[PDB]
Amino acid sequence: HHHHHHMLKKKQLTVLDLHPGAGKTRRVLPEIVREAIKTRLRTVILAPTRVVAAEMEEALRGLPVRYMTTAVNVTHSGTEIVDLMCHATFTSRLLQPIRVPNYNLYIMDEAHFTDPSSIAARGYISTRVEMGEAAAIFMTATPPGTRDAFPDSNSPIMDTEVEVPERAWSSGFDWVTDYSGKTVWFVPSVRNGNEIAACLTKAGKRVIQLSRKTFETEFQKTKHQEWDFVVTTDISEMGANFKADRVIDSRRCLKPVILDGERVILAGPMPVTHASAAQRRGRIGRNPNKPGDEYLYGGGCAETDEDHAHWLEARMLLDNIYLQDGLIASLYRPEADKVAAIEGEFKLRTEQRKTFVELMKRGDLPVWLAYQVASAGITYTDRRWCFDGTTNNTIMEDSVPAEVWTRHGEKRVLKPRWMDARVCSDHAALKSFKEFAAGKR
Ligand SMILES: Nc1ncnc2c1ncn2[C@@H]1O[C@H](COP(=O)(O)OP(=O)(O)O)[C@@H](O)[C@H]1O
Ligand code: BEF
Ligand SMILES: [Mn+2]
């Protein structure tokens, strides 16, 4: 009930870069949506995750918003001119035949998200603005290329550089376990998080683990049950709210890297960006009444992340989104220097584009891998490629060849024609890929 008037300018992109916890998501977003409604601007709100989409409903209760996500179960009047969906849904719809409205205003929250669908959505939106067809607001405390890892916070934070373990320990890290508060611990990989979580559990701690595959289900447990540690990958940088007193940050993670144009490996761990570091630290210091919060960090930051597969993968997506005849959207300008590709090199014809989309949406394949399969002319249900690669593409778990009973009634060793380490980097990813290779997804 203290609305501040925003003069929403046509043909403009604004970056709302207030510090973490300043109220972008909970205060400024509703104000903008009210102005958009008042002035009758057809508007889309882009949430990074289903978890945040649900929370945005609380902030927007009593405003006419169409929630285009099963994460919210609200009765729609059919008259709403504001739509809410996830970054990934927005990009996926753009790749499909499905008509996406030509919105007058795009509001992307947690616009730092570097998953390929988010990077692509930013390119599309910025292109629409540059063409004079729409306005946009990108909300993030950490715009592309920030070099500040220690922004302002609602309460003071105690910043300390320490040695952070990335393996189980039996001594040398008493400060981790001799602590009666609640800790969010950012780890370099799902497997390292499993090992640390087991160590913590053996030491009597209650641990919840979060990764992209599990986030949308395990995050609820952080609200609804008692815990001592959350052990999380980078997915928790995207507007994740914890009632926590301490963050432990390894400051590095495994990175997918395309090697010689022919395979994806997981390299590193390599340092995180300043943006990632500031978002990780930004999970604490958020309560103005609580002055004790600590950030313990394990090394430096770097901006040398052009080796990351996500940039090229964003181009694969954008190349397959229609704007106008002959026009391919560039990445948003601050990100466009991250990748050297020819605009349109990854454009697919209609049937192959359909396969590319289905491999990602229903197959849950990484963008790069989905592209290799689709561009080879393979149809979605034809899994022969999972078995006919070279011998060095053999997938191992527990030091033995992963084996599958195939749709054609043979026990076969998983040996994909194209190797993307993301499909076999932890037990759960591998299980899903084995199902896929069996024709049982
Ligand atoms: N359910 C809640 N009730 C009350 N305050 C909350 C709730 N969730 C978050 N907050 C607080 O609201 C403030 C603004 O949060 P938010 O808008 O999410 O920040 P930003 O998007 O700027 O990072 C912060 O102090 C945050 O901790
Ligand atoms: F910048 Be807030 F943490 F979304
Ligand atoms: Mn936010």
Author numbering: 177 to 617
Recite the paper's sentences.
A central question in discovering the molecular mechanism of a biological machine is understanding how chemical hydrolysis of the nucleotide (e.g., ATP) is coupled with conformational changes that result in mechanical work. To date, three species of metal fluoride complexes have enabled observation of molecular events that couple the catalytic steps of phosphoryl (PO3–) transfer to conformational changes by protein crystallography or cryo-electron microscopy (cryo-EM) and by 19F solution NMR. These are tetrahedral BeF3– ground state analogues (GSA), octahedral AlF4– transition state analogues (TSA) and trigonal bipyramidal (tbp), isosteric MgF3– TSA complexes. While motif V is known to be responsible for RNA binding in other NS3h,12,31 our results reveal how ATP hydrolysis can be coupled with mechanical translocation of RNA.
The tightening of the active site conformation is also seen in our 1.7 Å resolution crystal structure of the NS3h containing bound MnADP-BeF3–, which represents a GSA complex. The structure of this complex was obtained by soaking Be2+ and F– into NS3h-MnADP crystals. In this structure, the oxygen OW1 of the hydrolytic water molecule lies 3.7 Å from Be atom, donating H-bonds to F1 (3.1 Å) and to the side-chain C=O of Q455 (2.8 Å) in a prehydrolytic near attack conformation. These distances are significantly longer than those in an ssDNA-bound NS3h-MnADP-BeF3– complex for HCV,12 showing that polynucleotide binding for NS3h tightens the pre-TS complex. Conformation B adopts the “relaxed” position as in the structures of NS3h-MnADP-BeF3–, where the G415 amide is 4.0 Å from water OW1 and is H-bonded (3.4 Å) to the backbone carbonyl of E413. Second, OWat in the MgF3(Wat)− complex in the TS is liberated and moves 1.5 Å away from PG to become triply coordinated to O2A, O1G, and R459, which fix it 4.3 Å from the nucleophilic water Ow1 and thus unable to contribute to or impede catalysis of ATP hydrolysis. This additional water can also be found in the same location in both our NS3h-MnADP-BeF3– complex structure and in a high-resolution NS3h-ADP structure.
